[PDB]
Structure 1
């Protein structure tokens, strides 16, 4: 009933933003979906870290000690943003610590260690395919996976595919029960999300999310949302701009989430 209005409002937000906006909502109360450019490709940037962390969690289902396995951090492993890993240079971090740093602080060195643990970007993609995601592709390590060049298929997915995958990982059965709970705990402990999807939602709703930022002013967020009194929602908001040096626009993601919420 409200869906025509939501579509109109998302288009008006996009027009005022100057950029290109992609939205996918799944309401798990009734499997309703609301999409805006839901089948167009967008650069994932650091939102791809959810897939990498989940792939390591899947490996840990058959290796009970895997998350405690130490990984060496060398000075040469530091990249453009690595607030956790830099404390451990010439030392080690466990795979659990790398997963938490990648997800909750968006540490790019930590993401690179997860990618390497999976055999490279193609190993992350192979895990995506194993859980039914035919759209996701990871092609590069950080920081270059965040270049976000328009038209480049590398390191992209669609909002529809990412919402479905995030649902399967956090609420469905793609991971074992303990691993699903650990992923949800990590996402709920994210430090980077208060200005993005969360900022558009009622403060009483619990959120776990993973943000992303990259070239072309790319500003992304993927979230699982537990509204008050309601089954959870999954929401992807992806946003990218026409000039390489464009500024971040987390407010656009908040505005998209607000429009989605007001139409529930």
Structure 2
């Protein structure tokens, strides 16, 4: 299609490897580019950890209000919110929000611990029908994004389907789904990524990711004004370990997708 030709051209111009999956929930049509290739998730994996904790809260009704102590040893490489609460506590809701809206890595590690390790996050993916997602490591090493390494990867197709189920479907209870959507819509890290390629009037909830090898990711639910929502996953990684982030590629891919509608 026109869109696949434009995405291939964008990829060629960028020097890296681009993966895209769009689900249009109007007709459940899909647009895929490298849709079944594995990409390092980096921080887009935080959506799965937060959703797994939300799923737990369907039975443990007060779980999100449980205080979790932030100790100095807990701090890793990027902890914008957790740093503000060292030697104090954050609730699981606050940690989930921090992981999602600020990409706080300490928050992610506390969520992983709550789930019993990376295998607990992966188990939740399996439980909602995602056979592709795998979380193997904690922060910060899950961002190494080594070419060919299957650890901490998923495919665009799988992540788009899972994000659809979590936000628009019923993998979560009604209050939990609404909470997740609220958290994603409040993301603070996404302005230069998918959002930048879309009409300013569209509502977007997204989670970015970045890692080594210039890995630059964003996964989004998009609510166009007067139109069924869309789920868009854009993964990008580069051949040089020290490559710079390329959020503009994700913006451009979103723009190309949006043109085709």
For the aligned pair, the TM-score class normalised by the smaller chain equals over 0.9
- Which string of whole-angstrom CA distances, capped at 9 and with x for unpartnered residues, describes residues 136-166 of structure 1? 0000000001110000000000000000000
Q: CA RMSD in A?
A: 0.4
Please state if 1:257 is matched with 2:257.
no
Q: TM-score, normalised by structure 1?
A: 0.98
Q: What is the CA-CA distance between 1:102 and the residue it aligns to?
A: 0.2
Cα distance in 1 for residues equivalent to 2:179 and 2:52: 13
Please state if 1:114 is matched with 2:131.
no
Q: What is the CA-CA distance between 1:87 and the residue it aligns to?
A: 1.2
Q: TM-score, normalised by structure 2?
A: 1.00
Q: What is the CA-CA distance between 1:89 and the residue it aligns to?
A: 1.0
- Which string of whole-angstrom CA distances, capped at 9 and with x for unpartnered residues, describes residues 146-193 of structure 1? 110000000000000000000000000100000000000000000000
Q: What is the CA-CA distance between 1:198 and the residue it aligns to?
A: 0.5
Query: Secondary structure in 2 aligned to 1:185?
Result: helix
Query: Secondary structure in 1 aligned to 2:94?
Result: helix
Cα distance in 2 for residues equivalent to 1:28 and 1:56: 26
Cα distance in 1 for residues equivalent to 2:174 and 2:84: 32
- Which string of whole-angstrom CA distances, capped at 9 and with x for unpartnered residues, describes residues 197-219 of structure 1? 01000111000000000000000
Number of aligned pairs? 261
Gaps of 5+ in 1: none
Cα distance in 1 for residues equivalent to 2:29 and 2:9: 23
Q: What is the CA-CA distance between 1:91 and the residue it aligns to?
A: 1.1
Choose from 175, 186, 189 the match for 2:172: 175
Query: Secondary structure in 1 aligned to 2:220?
Result: strand
Q: What is the CA-CA distance between 1:72 and the residue it aligns to?
A: 1.0
Cα distance in 2 for residues equivalent to 1:207 and 1:95: 24
Query: Secondary structure in 1 aligned to 2:255?
Result: helix
Cα distance in 2 for residues equivalent to 1:241 and 1:206: 29
Aligned residue for 1:223? Answer: 220
Please state if 1:159 is matched with 2:164.
no
Query: Secondary structure in 2 aligned to 1:149?
Result: coil
